[PDB]
C-alpha cells in the first residue's frame, strides 16, 4: 500500500497523485464505476496492453491496485522529477532563449526510441500507438531524459492530424505527425499551425505551410522535422528512417 502526498493534477483519464511507498511514485486513478461490464473489459484490455511496455524512455509501470470500495483502478507508475516538456517550452519563451540544438536532438532521439518500442515491440507483443503525443505527455527525469507517458486511452495541430481531417484511422504515421508538431514547437517555441478556430486551423494545415524553424537550427534538423509534417502519411519517415538520420549520434541516446 502507499501514502498520498498530494494531487499533481487531473488528466483526461482521471486524477494523478504523487505518492510514496519511501520510494516516490505516482498513481493514475481510473474510475471504472460508471462503466458497463463490456466497457470495464475494454479498460482491462488497454491497461494490460500498456502495462507490458518497457523502455528507459517510457514512463515505467510498477503495479496496479484494484480498489473495489472506490470503484477505482490505481495504476502505479514512475514519478518524473523534471516535470513535463510543456514547461520547458514556456520557460524558453519567458527567458527569450531557444533550446540548444543538442537538447532538441536528445528529445527527438529518445522520443523516437520510445515510439520505436511501441510501433515495433521488442518482445513479440502487440503494436501500440501513443495517440496523445504532445509536450504535456512528455515527462523528464532528474537528468532531463525523456519519459513518454500518459498514453491515449483547441486551435492546435496536436488534435488535428491530416488522418483525422481525411477520415482515416489513426496510424503509426499519425504518431509521427504529432512528433513533428512537438519537435517543431520545441524549436520555434510555438506550434507550426496556429488559429482561433478548428476551421481556420484546418485551412492552415490543408495548405501544409509553416515558417522554417529558427535559423539557430541546422538545415538537416529543419528538414527531418518538416518531413514529419508532410500531409501524406506515406511521405512521413518511420521511426527507423528518423533514427537513420546523420544528426543522431550515440550521446543523444542518454544524458
Ligand atoms: C503539470 N506538471 C507536469 C507537474 O506539475 C509536475 C511537476 C514536477 C514533476 C512532475 N512529475 C510527473 N508528473 C506526471 O503527471 C503530471 C500530471 C498528469 C495529469 C495532467 C496534469 C499533470 C507523471 N505521470 C507519470 N509520471 C509523472 N511524473 C509533474
UniProtKB/Swiss-Prot annotation:
GO terms for biological process: blastocyst development; cell division; centrosome separation; chromosome segregation; meiotic cell cycle; mitotic cell cycle; mitotic spindle assembly; negative regulation of centriole-centriole cohesion. Isoform 1 and isoform 2 are expressed in peripheral blood T-cells and a wide variety of transformed cell types. Isoform 1 and isoform 4 are expressed in the testis. Up-regulated in various cancer cell lines, as well as primary breast tumors. One of its GO terms (cellular component) is microtubule. The modification Phosphothreonine is found at residue 156. Induction: Expression and activity peak in the G2 phase of the mitotic cycle and decrease once the cells have entered mitosis due to degradation by the anaphase promoting complex APC/C-CDC20. In G1 phase, both isoform 1 and isoform 2 are almost undetectable. However, at the G1/S transition, there is an increase in expression of both isoforms which then remain at this increased level throughout S and G2. At the onset of mitosis, isoform 1 undergoes a rapid disappearance whereas isoform 2 continues to be present at about the same level as in G2. The active site is at 132 (proton acceptor). Changing residue 132 to A: Loss of autophosphorylation. Its EC number is 2.7.11.1. Activated by autophosphorylation. Protein phosphatase 1 represses autophosphorylation and activation of isoform 1 by dephosphorylation. Phosphorylation by STK3/MST2 is necessary for its localization to the centrosome. ATP binds at residues 8-16, 28. Its cofactor is Mg(2+). The modification Phosphoserine is found at residues 161, 218. Isoform 1 is inhibited by ionizing radiation in the presence of PPP1CA. Its catalytic activity is inhibited by the inhibitor CCT241950. In the presence of this inhibitor, displays an autoinhibited conformation: Tyr-61 side chain points into the active site, interacts with the activation loop, and blocks the alphaC helix. The keyword Magnesium applies. It comes from the Eukaryota. Residues 2-248 form the Protein kinase domain. Changing residue 156 to A: Loss of kinase activity. It is an enzyme of class 2 (transferase). Keywords: ATP-binding, Cell cycle, Cell division, Centromere, Chromosome, Chromosome partition, Coiled coil, Cytoplasm, Cytoskeleton, Kinase, Kinetochore, Magnesium, Meiosis, Metal-binding, Microtubule, Mitosis, Nucleotide-binding, Nucleus, Phosphoprotein, Retinitis pigmentosa, Serine/threonine-protein kinase, Transferase. The leucine-zipper domain is required for its dimerization and activation. Protein kinase which is involved in the control of centrosome separation and bipolar spindle formation in mitotic cells and chromatin condensation in meiotic cells. Regulates centrosome separation (essential for the formation of bipolar spindles and high-fidelity chromosome separation) by phosphorylating centrosomal proteins such as CROCC, CEP250 and NINL, resulting in their displacement from the centrosomes. Regulates kinetochore microtubule attachment stability in mitosis via phosphorylation of NDC80. Isoform 1, isoform 2 and isoform 4 form homo- and heterodimers. Interacts with NECAB3 and HMGA2. Isoform 1 interacts with CDC20, CTNB1, MAD1L1, MAPK, NEK11, NPM1, NDC80, PCNT and SGO1. Isoform 1 interacts with STK3/MST2 (via SARAH domain) and SAV1 (via SARAH domain). Isoform 1 and isoform 2 interact with MAD2L1. Isoform 1 and isoform 4 interact with PPP1CA and PPP1CC. Interacts with CEP68; the interaction leads to phosphorylation of CEP68. Interacts with CNTLN; the interaction leads to phosphorylation of CNTLN. Isoform 1 interacts with CEP85. This is Serine/threonine-protein kinase Nek2. The chain holds residues 7 to 271 of 445 of the full protein.
Amino acid at each position: 500500500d502507499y501514502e498520498v502526498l498530494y494531487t499533481i493534477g487531473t488528466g483526461s483519464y482521471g486524477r494523478c497523485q504523487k505518492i510514496r511507498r519511501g520510494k516516490i511514485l505516482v498513481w493514475k486513478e481510473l474510475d471504472y464505476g460508471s462503466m458497463t461490464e463490456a466497457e470495464k473489459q475494454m479498460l482491462v484490455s488497454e491497461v494490460n496492453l500498456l502495462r507490458e511496455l518497457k523502455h528507459p524512455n517510457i514512463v515505467r509501470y510498477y503495479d496496479r491496485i484494484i480498489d473495489r470500495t472506490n470503484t477505482t483502478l490505481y495504476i502505479v507508475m514512475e514519478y518524473c522529477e523534471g516535470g513535463d516538456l510543456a514547461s520547458v517550452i514556456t520557460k524558453g519563451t519567458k527567458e527569450r532563449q531557444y533550446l540548444d540544438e543538442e537538447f532538441v536532438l536528445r528529445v527527438m532521439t529518445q522520443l523516437t526510441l520510445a515510439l520505436k518500442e511501441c510501433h515495433r515491440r521488442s518482445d513479440g507483443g502487440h503494436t501500440v500507438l501513443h495517440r496523445d503525443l504532445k509536450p504535456a505527455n512528455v515527462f523528464l527525469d532528474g537528468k532531463q531524459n525523456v519519459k513518454l507517458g500518459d498514453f491515449g486511452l483547441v486551435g492546435t495541430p496536436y488534435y488535428m492530424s491530416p488522418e483525422q481531417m481525411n477520415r482515416m484511422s489513426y496510424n503509426e504515421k499519425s504518431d509521427i505527425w504529432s512528433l513533428g508538431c512537438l519537435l517543431y514547437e520545441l524549436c520555434a517555441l510555438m506550434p507550426p499551425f496556429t488559429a482561433f478556430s478548428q476551421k481556420e486551423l484546418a485551412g492552415k494545415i490543408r495548405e501544409g505551410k509553416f515558417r522554417r524553424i529558427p535559423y539557430r537550427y541546422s538545415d538537416e534538423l529543419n528538414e527531418i522535422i518538416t518531413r514529419m509534417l508532410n500531409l501524406k502519411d506515406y511521405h512521413r519517415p518511420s521511426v527507423e528512417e528518423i533514427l537513420e538520420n546523420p544528426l543522431i549520434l550515440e550521446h543523444h541516446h542518454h544524458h
